[PDB]
Symmetry: C3
Subunit: 273 residues, 3 copies
Amino acid sequence: GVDLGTENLYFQSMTLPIRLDIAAPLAEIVLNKPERRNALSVDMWAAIPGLVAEANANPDVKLILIHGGDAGAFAAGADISEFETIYATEDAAKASGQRIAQALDAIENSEKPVIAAIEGACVGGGVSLAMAADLRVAGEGAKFGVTPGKLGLVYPAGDTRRLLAAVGPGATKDILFTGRIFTAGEAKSLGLIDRLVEKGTALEAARVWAGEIAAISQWSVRATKRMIRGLQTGWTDETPEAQSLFLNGFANEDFKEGYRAFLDKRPAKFTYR
Amino acid sequence: SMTLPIRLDIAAPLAEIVLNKPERRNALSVDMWAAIPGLVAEANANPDVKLILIHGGDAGAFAAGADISEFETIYATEDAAKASGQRIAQALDAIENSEKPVIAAIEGACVGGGVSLAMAADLRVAGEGAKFGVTPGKLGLVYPAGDTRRLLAAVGPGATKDILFTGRIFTAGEAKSLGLIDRLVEKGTALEAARVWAGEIAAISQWSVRATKRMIRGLQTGWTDETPEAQSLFLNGFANEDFKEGYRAFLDKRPAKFTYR
Amino acid sequence: TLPIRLDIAAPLAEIVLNKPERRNALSVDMWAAIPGLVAEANANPDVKLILIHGGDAGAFAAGADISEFETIYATEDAAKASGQRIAQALDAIENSEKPVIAAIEGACVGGGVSLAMAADLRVAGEGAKFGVTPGKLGLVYPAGDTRRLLAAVGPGATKDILFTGRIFTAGEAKSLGLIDRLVEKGTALEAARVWAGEIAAISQWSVRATKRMIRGLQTGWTDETPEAQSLFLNGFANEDFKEGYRAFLDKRPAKFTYR
């Protein structure tokens, strides 16, 4: 038995403003500043790459979810109380940008797929988080907006890329040129979110969707994600990586089992973790 | 100004490129195409102008294709045809690359050159009853690279092939559905809708608006997250006069009054 | 009973899948034949458009043929050759000089989707079913097939399709942009023929040049690319335009001759 520690350590671990819950085959990145409607702070951004790494290193985890817990919001934009710190100097502002880019890139490049489950406010950094995920499900009543234009800022290259790829140039320009807040219904219509469900059911829907993906070959799921990311970043049909990834399709432990299951006339029981 | 087949109206914070050949339903002529880069430049140089609109005025059409009366002249020789192509490309590229955003407000016929004009704009709103078509295939021509690129980016390969392979005329409803236009509004209200939409964009940071357009164009022409120009554009976000004000306004809990022009 | 064939009925050529007893499940010999059929259609001057459909099997293509699984995947080398063979077939369809329209009824799964996405245009009947299932076997969808899917439906929808391997309806396929037209059940072939008729009526020089321009732009051409510029300029110096220009001056219908 590992040492049970102290109340202060326990309280510190619960009050972390973002955390990773493990419930195999899921890991859940839970935004956990409910008293500020999950407005994104420095320490939240700083923690994300570590949480993503933890989920990816745990073999019981197949899929990662990202959601707002019981805050009643996904993320209500940036925390205005930190504005004075993050923008005090050019250096602090630059570091803020890097910290955010690292968090978003870590989510985007996660070996394991990431599903965002969105209720209530999903604004600014919230949209950026959501778009870094592979898949997005939102409850009715959720609200979306990207607002650097209301501040005199510009949305970064990565965030803009991810948005463009989902909604196209016209819709991206509308969103960013106006900074307007729009409904889940419009988000669905624009292609910003992939599924629209009944209010308060996004998390359950994400879990069931994740369950479906978890049931198939995880070798395939992860390879698929690499293939897609590869193609988005310039791979062609001739690219050696793309060819070898395809050929590894026939040489991996899941296909070995899939092939055996087809011959034995039984369900496949995939083992790749 | 009212005899001019195309003109620029200034009504701060808007500039409006108004097509004005109502007797040919704004069919595009050499002198219209030739004037466009100058009108765009004028709008971009005027600090009172934040947004540019393109529309068909009171002709009842956005643009009813090419002017048939000039066909003979433009295509008489290989040289004339080449010059026509260059002139049109210059007009469309000028619109596309406008530092300030451009919104097309479309009523009635939007055919051929009309679609090209519309796709060069950043944003498109059309009234119901507007009609769309791209018809070089009906003549033995090919739609240029730039025009094709812009169409592809909006509607995707399948839809682009449908449009160009058939040369068919389709409704505003279908155009909306395909992603060719961004907004579909009640017939006769496209201009008003474009003005209000432009109003919304005008109210925010114009530093941001213009930077956003550069970032997007950059990403479309090969920029990555690592590209130096993309990084410096982002960092200039924290160093510009609008952000200084935006930051203050967020802390004071008042509307931002942005000054960058 | 050839398992795949080319029917000529000017101005159409039709690539007809014809293994009804397996609901047109795709085999080695089907894949191997495709580049030749495409070449035949393209070389025949009476042919303007190519259709691809499942004939009277009641299905477009019901995935891969399970009976050849053992052979194709017996070794790394066989599997690699399979991949090359399939890629050649799909690339031949995609790069066809003449446009290709897929007419889809019933099952369109796996290789079926790959075939459909290689075509330029897709029309499906209601009741058609779609799915891409390499994930259910431990395989990965190839680069070319994935590219073509992405370009039509976007990253989110592509991930949904491939991560789940789920079977979805023609209605959802239409909604996702996977197919271009959705028609009444059992009418996809007739709809494809009429659509092909419309395209056949205009300049085939333009149709083919348009396709090259688009493919060019997708594979890295810019407005400055020499091939893009010369393709545009050839628009004014081909036999169809020469006729189109004459017809305009004479005030008569154009009768295009390029084939």
